[model samples]
Target: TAEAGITGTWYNQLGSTLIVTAGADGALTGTYESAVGNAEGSYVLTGRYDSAPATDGSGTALGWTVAWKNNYRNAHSASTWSGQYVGGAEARINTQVLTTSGTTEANAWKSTLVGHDTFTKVK
Candidate 1:
């Protein structure tokens, strides 16, 4: 499982940057760089590995849960990302919740704005 964990730096089309570190316990942490202004923050990622290969045909897909603070206007957000591990690298799709506040003002945020991020194993 240690070998399965991916640790690397990722860059994307939206100018979003990420430093990914995966643990043998199936936990991951990503330091994210905001595409808007390069504001940086950390996101906790809960991941699950599939013994069977993902059918998406890109690579072996890993399912993940992503959560972060101060995202999208100082609000907490979370999303589920699924991607395929191509060779020693992987491409993850971002699907995040965008909101201004809690119950007072909450709505389904647009996912179209989130872009695809590719990661390469650094460790």
Candidate 2:
């Protein structure tokens, strides 16, 4: 399964690094190193990979989350990313993410939290 092959080191354009382990039953567990945040050290990463073909038929759907040790304004935040793993000559993962920081109010979680990032396998 491509899921098995997805386990490795990947870096996003932002320079954040992720090292993943593809485990039984589509489980994705890993560690993340932030390159652009007040958050320091390694953080836990948890997600799932769906081997079923994606809507575009270009790859498979996957999603992951990270709880930052610290972030904007030195407040706590978390990011959830939804992505697709594309294999072949251009193996990569394209993702859209939503982040919530410093507040529990749903109203404050606006469009500002949304963005996109792409990652390429490096190992």
Candidate 3:
């Protein structure tokens, strides 16, 4: 349970960025975008986080409804996500598209999970 402090810029090792902002009531808003230099188009995500539990754990289980689209609209699908804000800096997310959003991740990953992002606060 944070005091609405999960607002900042985060990034992965591959140069992808996740920008998040917390509301006055602990609500979450953010965006995730891939590098434009990639070939699979952009992951371009724009969504808001509802105050829901990702699961019965000590983490945020908010329902994440993100837009999966870009130059390649064929892979677009809404994904349900579960994420955790750890140590007030690191964020771990595990998501799934209940209707077969294709298990392939940004790097041709093969798994039931739709997408995952791990970010560390930079600002």
Best by TM-score: 2
- Tell me the RMSD of model 1 versus the true structure: 5.5
Instruction: Give the per-residue lDDT digits (tens) of candidate 2, residues 1-123.
Output: 666658889899998898988765788999888777667777889999985555555677899998886333333778888988888766898999987776547657452488898999763
Clashes of 2: 0
Displacement of the residue 87 alpha carbon in candidate 1, Å: 1.3
lDDT of 3 by residue, 45-75 (tens): 4445444434444665443445565556555
Candidate 1 lDDT score at position 31? 62
Which run of 10 residues does model 1 get worst, by summed lDDT? 97-106
lDDT of 1 by residue, 42-103 (tens): 55555654445544554554656545455534445454556655553443433332222233
